[PDB]
């Protein structure tokens, strides 16, 4: 699909058997989702941005469906102001920037 | 050009004669640049991200060249770790997301 940037680039993702709204963010290395319960063991990690750092739970090899395209990788969960799909999963669905 | 996301999407920008590297951020509403002394009036603003908020200065109608593409718009200047080109300017250079 071709997505313009007049509005926030939000899409629907299926994390397990759960639908969520997420922002395609090329300015993020990682994928961070609001606090939610996920299966598996998680390691505490720390990620930062504007404003500073926050502590998050890391989950590996998690399946995520982004607008129909399947991906499997790392997902961080924590006090993020918004759900964001980072470059770790965007590359998996062959997403690129063009202009 | 087509930009992949294997690495951070850093490009060269021309602001007021000085050239710097900026991150193409679809996850940013605004364009935030590292501290610099631009001419003109500016209103104080608060922008938020992952670790909270930071105060920045807002300048309007600022000329900026992104990899050879001329654009003009609002530019926030504050203590940001990196230079960020938000959607306000990306919609001006025809930048889209594709997959």
């Amino acid at each position: 699909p071709q997505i313009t940037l007049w509005k926030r680039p939000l899409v629907t993702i299926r994390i397990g058997g759960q639908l969520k709204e997420a922002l395609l963010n090329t300015g993020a290395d990682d994928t961070v989702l609001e606090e939610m319960n996920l299966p598996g063991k998680w390691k505490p990690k720390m990620i930062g941005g504007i404003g500073g750092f926050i502590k998050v739970r890391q989950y590996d090899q998690i399946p995520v469906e982004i607008c129909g395209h399947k991906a499997i990788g790392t997902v961080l969960v924590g006090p993020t102001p918004a759900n964001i799909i980072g470059r770790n999963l965007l590359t998996q669905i062959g997403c690129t920037l063009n202009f | 050009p087509q930009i992949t996301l294997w690495k951070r999407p850093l490009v060269t920008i021309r602001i007021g004669g000085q050239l710097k590297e900026a991150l193409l951020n679809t996850g940013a509403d605004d364009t935030v640049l590292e501290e610099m002394n631009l001419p003109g009036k500016w209103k104080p603003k608060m922008i938020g991200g992952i670790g909270g908020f930071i105060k920045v200065r807002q300048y309007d109608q600022i000329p900026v060249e992104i990899c050879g593409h001329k654009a003009i718009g609002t530019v926030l200047v504050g203590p940001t770790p990196a230079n960020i080109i938000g959607r306000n300017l990306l919609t001006q250079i025809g930048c889209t997301l594709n997959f």
């Binding site: 941005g49 964001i84 | 991200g49």
Partner: peptide
């Protein structure tokens, strides 16, 4: 406004 830049 939100600038969701992020890095680990």
């Amino acid at each position: 406004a939100r600038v969701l830049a992020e890095a680990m």
